[PDB]
Structures are given as structure tokens and as C-alpha cells.
Amino acid sequence: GVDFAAEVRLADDVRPADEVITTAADPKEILLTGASGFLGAFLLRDLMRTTTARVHCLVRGADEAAAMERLKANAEWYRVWDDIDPERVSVVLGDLAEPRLGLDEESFDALARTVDVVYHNGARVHWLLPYETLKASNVTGTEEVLRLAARHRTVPVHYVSTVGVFDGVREPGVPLRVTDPTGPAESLPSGYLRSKWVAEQVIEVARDRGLPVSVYRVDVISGDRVNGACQTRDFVWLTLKGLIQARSVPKGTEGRFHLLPVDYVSAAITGISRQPGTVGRTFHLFNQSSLALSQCVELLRSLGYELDEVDWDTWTQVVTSGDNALLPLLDAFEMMTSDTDGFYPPIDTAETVAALEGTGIGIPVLTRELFEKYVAFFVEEGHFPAA
Numbered sequence: 001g002v003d004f005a006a007e008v009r010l011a012d013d014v015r016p017a018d019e020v021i022t023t024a025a026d027p028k029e030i031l032l033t034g035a036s037g038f039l040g041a042f043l044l045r046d047l048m049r050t051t052t053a054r055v056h057c058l059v060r061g062a063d064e065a066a067a068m069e070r071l072k073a074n075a076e077w078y079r080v081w082d083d084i085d086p087e088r089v090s091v092v093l094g095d096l097a098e099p100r101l102g103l104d105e106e107s108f109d110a111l112a113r114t115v116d117v118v119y120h121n122g123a124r125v126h127w128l129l130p131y132e133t134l135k136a137s138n139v140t141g142t143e144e145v146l147r148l149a150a151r152h153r154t155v156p157v158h159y160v161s162t163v164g165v166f167d168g169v170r171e172p173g174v175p176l177r178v179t180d181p182t183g184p185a186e187s188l189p190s191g192y193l194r195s196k197w198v199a200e201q202v203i204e205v206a207r208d209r210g211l212p213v214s215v216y217r218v219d220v221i222s223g224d225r226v227n228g229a230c231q232t233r234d235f236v237w238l239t240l241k242g243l244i245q246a247r248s249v250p251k252g253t254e255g256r257f258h259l260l261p262v263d264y265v266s267a268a269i270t271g272i273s274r275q276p277g278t279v280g281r282t283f284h285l286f287n288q289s290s291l292a293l294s295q296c297v298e299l300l301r302s303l304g305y306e307l308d309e310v311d312w313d314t315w316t317q318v319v320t321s322g323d324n325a326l327l328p329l330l331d332a333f334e335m336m337t338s339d340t341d342g343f344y345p346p347i348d349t350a351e352t353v354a355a356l357e358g359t360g361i362g363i364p365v366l367t368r369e370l371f372e373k374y375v376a377f378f379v380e381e382g383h384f385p386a387a
């Protein structure tokens, strides 16, 4: 068993420099981690649109040219590369899982001295791996990012977290507040969520030492509202994919999905990060609105997919018979449908709506058109079968 109370520690060298900058209006040099991933591609695009800064992107790879091509191909898959200015993209070859982010002395020192703000979005998101395996990327990597931001000149870190650090609701029916206790780690169902919980706790120590660190706890991210571009391996779309594959759905089974478009998340995080009086605070990004499971099924039926209603046993035997995206998620699908309110605790977002007042930034409505864009993206990219 992991002693999670002992895992909450920040190396004593991670402390504010003599100069501490708490805002980053009009930044000139930005460090972004996780730019070769889903949210990171949209964070990169939005920083291009909302600053004039060069964006140093920490990317793993053999050499800068190969890392650049990885970053590019990811952005092209999400259909945002055309919105990015490559002349403002600077690849920083490194690794969240190794000391000083895998940088050499010259690069570490130069970024520590000159980056105006850090968006710490990179992490290893694996729903099964144990905490011990994810610690280096997700916890120690966060400590290393904090080390870099703090050293020489202290600049703000904007850390992407998850509403999953909560173990359900504090008081029934009361939306979870940004100040509410999280964890305990042992109550969280995955090593991944436990690693994010530890990172947050490490960040609380940094905050207690005077280091400027904002935290954005994000819920499930769905595709962008323009092209529908979305990662493939999340519970929502694998659930719907499984139903499509099984060509059926269990009778009398209802649930919901709180979809949060990725381009809302990127715009919100970057937008809040410039709003006044937000540095050092924690924010919840969560869509109060949802699409019911029955709504998704009806929408898929209207697109031409065969989804016959069958008894639970017949359905689960189809799913467990092989080649079905839901098979490893059957337990989660059953928990979500049998106690949906328990599965999706209410989340308070008032601080988030207030900070975004007047920014033009808002969650899109979950329309039929939006849903159809989502399915169309997966069908074109080969992730969903055609109807």
C-alpha cells in the first residue's frame, strides 16, 4: 500500500525567487506541457490567438525535428495546425518523467529565467496504470515544472487537473466547491486520479510557500464545436461505440454524459489565466447540462445506426462475446446507469462563470448538430463505423 500522506511533499528547493510575478498579461515567452495531446493542441492554438508570445512546447522525442513532426501531426489530426503559427512554436526536447524535465543546464536555466507563464497540461492519462507507475510523469513531473517556474524568477503556473480528485459529493445534492476537501487518495478508483490528487496536494504546498499556481479541474472533454475533433479513448464515446458495435442497447437503462467541448476548455483556461484576481485560485470546468443516454441513442438511430432494445443479459452477452469497446467498461457503464446522480456528483462552477463574465467564452449547447459533428468526425477518422 502507498503511504499517500507521505507522498504529499514538495522538495525544499522549490521556493519563490526574489522576483515573483503573479500575472502574465501580454506574455512574450510561454512554456506549454502536453502540446502533443488533445487539450494541449487546443491550448497551443488559443495561446496563438490570445497572445503574441513564443510558445515553448515540451515534447518527448529523439530529436527536435522528430518532436516537431509529432506536435504537427497531432495538431493536424485535431485540425488546428492551420490555426497555429509554426514560427511561434519552439520545441523543447524533454520528458516530464525525468529530472529537470530532461533538459540540459542551458535550456533549463534559460526557460527558468525567461518564461513568463507556464501552462502545465501534460500528464500520462491511463485509466488502469497504478499510482507508482504514473508518479514520475504526473507528480514528480509537476514538481519539476514548479521548480522551473519558481527558480531565478518566479512566474505563474496554470495546472490542468480533474474533477475526479473528488470522492463523490460532500453533502448530498450540494455542488462540490473549489474549496471542498478532495480525496482521500485511497478512495479514488484509479492510479491516475490518485496521481492528480497528489499533484494538487503538492501544489497546495507550493501555494503555501508563496508560489503562484492556479488549478483548473476539468470534467470529461468532448470534441471542438467547429470540427468535432476529439480523442478516441474516453468513456463517453467508447460507450456509444460499444452500443453501435453491439447493435443494441439494454432496455430500461438510462444515464447521461456531461460533455465539455475541448475548445471551451482551452479558451476558459487561457482566458481565466489572464483575468484579474484569478492567480493562485482553483476553478471547476464542468457542464451543468448533459445529454441523456436515451438522447444519444435516439440521435444515433436517426443517423441510421441499428440499436435494438434488448434485455440486460442478452446485451451483456453480446458485449462480452468479443470485439466490443464497452467490454472493459461494463462495470463502469453499469454503475453510471444504475446510480447516475452518484456517478456524476454535482460540481460548482460559479467562480468559473464569474471569472469568464464578459469574455465571450461559453459552453456550447449540446445540440443535435454538435452531436452529429462528433459522430461525423469519428466516422471520417475511422474510429466509429459508418451507419
Ligand SMILES: NC(=O)C1=CN([C@@H]2O[C@H](COP(=O)(O)OP(=O)(O)OC[C@H]3O[C@@H](n4cnc5c(N)ncnc54)[C@H](OP(=O)(O)O)[C@@H]3O)[C@@H](O)[C@H]2O)C=CC1
Residues within 6 Å of the ligand: 033, 034, 035, 036, 037, 038, 039, 040, 058, 059, 060, 094, 095, 096, 097, 120, 121, 122, 123, 124, 125, 137, 160, 161, 162, 163, 196, 217, 218, 219, 220, 221, 231, 234
Ligand atoms: N477528458 C480529458 O481528456 C481530461 C483531461 N484532463 C487533463 O488534461 C490534461 C491533458 O490530458 P489529455 O489532453 O486529455 O490527454 P492526452 O493523452 O491527449 O495529452 C497528454 C499529454 O501529456 C503529455 N505527456 C505525458 N507523459 C509525458 C512525459 N513523460 N513527458 C512529456 N510529455 C508527456 C503527452 O505527450 P506524448 O504525446 O509524448 O504522450 C501529451 O502531450 C491532462 O493534465 C489531464 O489530466 C482532465 C480532465 C479530463
